[PDB]
Amino acid sequence: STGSATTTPIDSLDDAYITPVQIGTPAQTLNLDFDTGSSDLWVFSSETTASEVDGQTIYTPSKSTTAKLLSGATWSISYGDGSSSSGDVYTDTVSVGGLTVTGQAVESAKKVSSSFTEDSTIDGLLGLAFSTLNTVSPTQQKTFFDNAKASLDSPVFTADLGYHAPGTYNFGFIDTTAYTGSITYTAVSTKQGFWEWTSTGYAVGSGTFKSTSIDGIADTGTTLLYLPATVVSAYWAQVSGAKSSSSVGGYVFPCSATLPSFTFGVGSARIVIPGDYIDFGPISTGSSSCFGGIQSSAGIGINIFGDVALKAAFVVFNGATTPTLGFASK
């Protein structure tokens, strides 16, 4: 089997991407944030504290003839950005882009933090990291990909995120029309539950490539590119007036600037992030200070190849017995 679904930016900045997901019978379609950095499929629901729902579409398990309470199961998750959610668990039929899994754990939120409430466009998350990170207790549950894998034509999914435009998540096949040149594959460590890999270096603009190992995660659920402070300083030093602002929480730059590109290495191959992908717009409405899309990972404890980086590539998440990651230009 295969599936193919369009993923759409939630706003004009590509702060996140949403993908429609069918849950239950008859189908209830919710727009979920596909997150290769976590492993829970959770939704706003009829059980979510009413004051914490503001515009989201909810899953109502009592209206699904295939929903079954997973007795005694609870979940609770905290994300890198300080947001969180928790609740109980149903199993139900879940379909993405024509690919159907029966008995998928659908984690129903009883509580969500303010950042989720405040984002009316995201109805929940669909985790695509390794199932070892799934938070359901006392019986850990599998991700949608893990459940689908054996049925797929090939045990892979691909992320093809757009810049200020829709893109595609495919399951079970590699669309050879979706990228240019060849896909370069690179080793993955699953030790921390992530799609963790080692970039071979970087360049800033038309500058020379610096060969250096950068361990980090391919994370569709993180907006920005988080790299070591040395790398980030070297990038922003090429932008007149750019500075790290403690009050804003990272690097900002004059909105009048033209940003240089940023290149990262994948083995001997190179992915080029155009400068415009690094512009996240005014820090507040009407400001001439703009937020940067490349930020320091210092104090995160891990480097994160988030959407800024991934949207410059066609990315293969290869879930073969030994997982790997593939990157192509597009």
**What residues does each domain of the chain span?**
5-174, 175-330
- Give the span between the Cα atoms of 46 and 211, in whole angstroms: 52
N-terminal to C-terminal alpha carbon distance within the chain? 25
Exposure on the CB side of residue 192, measured as CA atoms within 13 A: 15
- Alpha helical stretches, state H, 49-188: 114-117, 144-148
User: Cα–Cα–Cα angle for 25, 28, 164, nearest 5°?
Assistant: 145
Resolution in A: 1.2
The reply to whether domains 5-174 and 175-330 share a CATH topology is yes
CA distance 275 to 293: 9
DSSP type of residue 181:
S
Q: Are 294 and 224 in contact (CB under 8 A)?
A: yes
CA 4 to chain centre: 17
State the method: X-ray
Which parts of 225-313 are beta strand (E)?
225-227, 243-245, 250-254, 262-266, 269-273, 279-282, 289-292, 294-296, 303-305
- Listed in sequence order, the residues at least 6 apart from 275 whose beta carbon sits closer than 8 Å to its beta carbon are 205, 258, 259, 260, 261, 262
Known catalytic residues? 35, 199
* CA 266 to each of CA 59, 198, 274: distance values in angstroms, whole numbers, following the listed order: 40, 8, 17
Instruction: Give the three-class secondary structure for 207.
Output: coil
Cα–Cα distance, 228 to 264 (Å, whole number): 13
Q: Specify the CATH superfamily of domain 175-330.
A: Acid Proteases (2.40.70.10)
For the domain spanning 5-174, the CATH number is 2.40.70.10
